[PDB]
Protein backbone atom coordinates (compact mmCIF):
# COMPACT_ATOMS: atom_id res chain seq x y z
CA UNK A 1 0.00 0.00 0.00
CA UNK A 2 1.54 3.28 -1.16
CA UNK A 3 2.23 6.02 1.36
CA UNK A 4 -0.43 8.72 1.08
CA UNK A 5 0.30 12.35 1.85
CA UNK A 6 -1.88 15.45 1.89
CA UNK A 7 -0.30 18.69 0.73
CA UNK A 8 -1.82 22.16 1.03
CA UNK A 9 -0.11 25.22 -0.46
CA UNK A 10 -0.38 28.97 -0.87
CA UNK A 11 1.94 31.83 -1.73
CA UNK A 12 1.68 35.61 -2.12
CA UNK A 13 3.42 38.98 -1.89
CA UNK A 14 2.78 42.09 0.18
CA UNK A 15 1.97 44.05 -2.96
CA UNK A 16 2.85 42.55 -6.36
CA UNK A 17 5.67 42.49 -7.12
CA UNK A 18 7.16 42.80 -3.65
CA UNK A 19 8.31 40.89 -0.54
CA UNK A 20 6.76 37.45 -0.82
CA UNK A 21 6.36 34.14 0.92
CA UNK A 22 4.83 30.70 0.63
CA UNK A 23 3.18 28.36 3.09
CA UNK A 24 2.71 24.61 2.81
CA UNK A 25 1.36 21.90 5.08
CA UNK A 26 2.27 18.25 4.61
CA UNK A 27 -0.01 15.81 6.45
CA UNK A 28 0.78 12.13 6.90
CA UNK A 29 -1.11 9.88 9.35
CA UNK A 30 -2.52 12.69 11.45
CA UNK A 31 0.84 14.44 11.79
CA UNK A 32 1.46 17.73 10.00
CA UNK A 33 4.72 19.38 8.98
CA UNK A 34 4.88 23.04 8.00
CA UNK A 35 7.02 24.67 5.28
CA UNK A 36 7.50 28.42 4.74
CA UNK A 37 10.00 30.99 3.44
CA UNK A 38 10.08 34.68 2.61
CA UNK A 39 11.79 36.33 -0.37
CA UNK A 40 13.00 39.92 -0.65
CA UNK A 41 11.30 40.47 -4.01
CA UNK A 42 9.20 38.12 -6.11
CA UNK A 43 5.62 37.77 -7.46
CA UNK A 44 2.39 36.07 -6.33
CA UNK A 45 2.60 33.58 -9.21
CA UNK A 46 6.15 32.55 -8.36
CA UNK A 47 5.24 32.08 -4.68
CA UNK A 48 2.14 30.07 -5.58
CA UNK A 49 4.42 27.72 -7.57
CA UNK A 50 7.25 27.69 -5.04
CA UNK A 51 4.82 26.50 -2.37
CA UNK A 52 3.95 23.36 -4.33
CA UNK A 53 7.55 22.83 -5.44
CA UNK A 54 9.04 22.83 -1.94
CA UNK A 55 6.30 20.61 -0.45
CA UNK A 56 6.68 18.03 -3.22
CA UNK A 57 10.49 18.09 -3.11
CA UNK A 58 10.25 17.35 0.61
CA UNK A 59 9.01 13.83 -0.16
CA UNK A 60 11.80 11.28 0.25
CA UNK A 61 9.94 8.41 -1.44
CA UNK A 62 7.36 7.83 -4.17
CA UNK A 63 3.93 8.62 -2.65
CA UNK A 64 0.32 9.16 -3.56
CA UNK A 65 -0.24 12.91 -3.17
CA UNK A 66 -3.43 14.92 -2.78
CA UNK A 67 -2.29 18.47 -3.57
CA UNK A 68 -4.72 21.21 -2.62
CA UNK A 69 -4.37 24.83 -3.72
CA UNK A 70 -6.61 27.77 -4.56
CA UNK A 71 -4.10 29.14 -7.10
CA UNK A 72 -5.68 29.86 -10.50
CA UNK A 73 -2.21 30.22 -11.99
CA UNK A 74 -1.17 26.73 -10.89
CA UNK A 75 -4.56 25.28 -11.87
CA UNK A 76 -4.46 26.71 -15.41
CA UNK A 77 -0.82 25.76 -15.84
CA UNK A 78 -1.31 22.14 -14.80
CA UNK A 79 -4.57 21.60 -16.66
CA UNK A 80 -4.12 23.94 -19.63
CA UNK A 81 -0.58 25.18 -20.26
CA UNK A 82 2.19 22.76 -19.26
CA UNK A 83 0.99 20.20 -21.80
CA UNK A 84 1.39 22.65 -24.70
CA UNK A 85 4.63 24.15 -23.34
CA UNK A 86 6.35 20.76 -23.15
CA UNK A 87 5.40 19.80 -26.72
CA UNK A 88 6.83 23.10 -27.98
CA UNK A 89 10.10 22.74 -26.10
CA UNK A 90 8.87 25.40 -23.68
CA UNK A 91 8.12 28.23 -26.11
CA UNK A 92 4.81 29.57 -27.40
CA UNK A 93 3.90 29.83 -31.09
CA UNK A 94 4.66 33.55 -30.89
CA UNK A 95 8.22 32.45 -30.10
CA UNK A 96 7.91 34.19 -26.74
CA UNK A 97 9.66 32.60 -23.73
CA UNK A 98 7.55 30.98 -21.00
CA UNK A 99 7.33 33.12 -17.84
CA UNK A 100 8.69 31.41 -14.72
CA UNK A 101 9.94 28.53 -16.86
CA UNK A 102 12.50 27.91 -14.11
CA UNK A 103 9.81 27.14 -11.52
CA UNK A 104 7.46 25.43 -13.97
CA UNK A 105 10.16 22.91 -14.92
CA UNK A 106 11.15 22.38 -11.31
CA UNK A 107 7.48 21.72 -10.44
CA UNK A 108 6.99 19.39 -13.39
CA UNK A 109 10.05 17.42 -12.29
CA UNK A 110 8.80 17.06 -8.72
CA UNK A 111 5.31 16.09 -9.91
CA UNK A 112 6.65 13.33 -12.11
CA UNK A 113 8.05 11.54 -9.07
CA UNK A 114 4.66 10.86 -7.48
CA UNK A 115 1.03 9.99 -8.16
CA UNK A 116 -0.77 13.32 -7.77
CA UNK A 117 -4.45 14.10 -7.41
CA UNK A 118 -4.99 17.84 -7.71
CA UNK A 119 -7.68 19.57 -5.65
CA UNK A 120 -8.57 23.04 -6.90
CA UNK A 121 -10.20 24.97 -4.06
CA UNK A 122 -11.95 28.34 -4.31
CA UNK A 123 -12.44 29.95 -0.92
CA UNK A 124 -11.26 29.43 2.66
CA UNK A 125 -14.61 28.30 4.08
CA UNK A 126 -14.35 24.55 4.63
CA UNK A 127 -10.62 24.65 3.88
CA UNK A 128 -8.80 25.23 7.23
CA UNK A 129 -5.38 24.08 6.00
CA UNK A 130 -5.47 26.44 3.02
CA UNK A 131 -6.20 29.49 5.21
CA UNK A 132 -3.37 28.34 7.44
CA UNK A 133 -0.95 28.24 4.48
CA UNK A 134 -2.01 31.74 3.51
CA UNK A 135 -1.24 32.93 7.03
CA UNK A 136 2.17 31.22 6.91
CA UNK A 137 3.04 32.91 3.61
CA UNK A 138 1.96 36.35 4.80
CA UNK A 139 4.00 36.04 8.01
CA UNK A 140 7.11 34.89 6.12
CA UNK A 141 6.77 37.77 3.63
CA UNK A 142 7.17 40.20 6.55
CA UNK A 143 10.66 38.88 7.42
CA UNK A 144 12.13 37.54 4.14
CA UNK A 145 15.57 35.99 4.51
CA UNK A 146 15.89 34.50 1.02
CA UNK A 147 16.41 35.91 -2.46
CA UNK A 148 14.41 34.72 -5.48
CA UNK A 149 17.36 34.56 -7.88
CA UNK A 150 15.11 33.19 -10.61
CA UNK A 151 12.98 36.33 -10.53
CA UNK A 152 13.69 38.46 -13.61
CA UNK A 153 13.16 41.95 -12.17
CA UNK A 154 13.52 43.18 -15.77
CA UNK A 155 10.40 44.42 -17.55
Question: What is the number of domains?
Answer: 1
Biggest sheet, strands in spatial order?
Answer: 3-2-1-4-5
SSE run: EEEHEHHEH
Helix-and-strand structural type:
alpha/beta
Considering DSSP H and I runs of 4 or more, what fraction of the residues is helical? 25-40%
CATH fold topology: Nucleotidyltransferase, domain 5
- Intertermini distance: 49 Å
Biggest β-sheet: count, sense, barrel? Answer: 5 strands, mixed
- The CATH architecture designation is 2-Layer Sandwich
The radius of gyration computed from the alpha-carbon positions, rounded to a whole number of angstroms, is: 15 Å
Q: What is the beta-strand fraction?
A: 25-35%
Taken from the alpha-carbon principal axes, the silhouette is globular
User: With helices defined by DSSP (H or I, 4 residues minimum), what is the helix count?
Assistant: 4
Q: Count every beta strand, where a strand is a DSSP E run of 2 or more residues.
A: 5
CATH superfamily: Ribonuclease H-like superfamily/Ribonuclease H
- CATH classification, class level: Alpha Beta
PDB class: hydrolase
Keywords: RNase HI, hydrolase
Assembly: monomeric
Entry title: Crystal structure of E.coli RNase HI surface charged mutant(Q4R/T40E/Q72H/Q76K/Q80E/T92K/Q105K)
Amino acid sequence: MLKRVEIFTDGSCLGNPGPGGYGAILRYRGREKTFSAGYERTTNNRMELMAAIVALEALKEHCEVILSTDSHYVRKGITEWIHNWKKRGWKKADKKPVKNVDLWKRLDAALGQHQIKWEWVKGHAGHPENERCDELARAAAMNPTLEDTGYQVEV
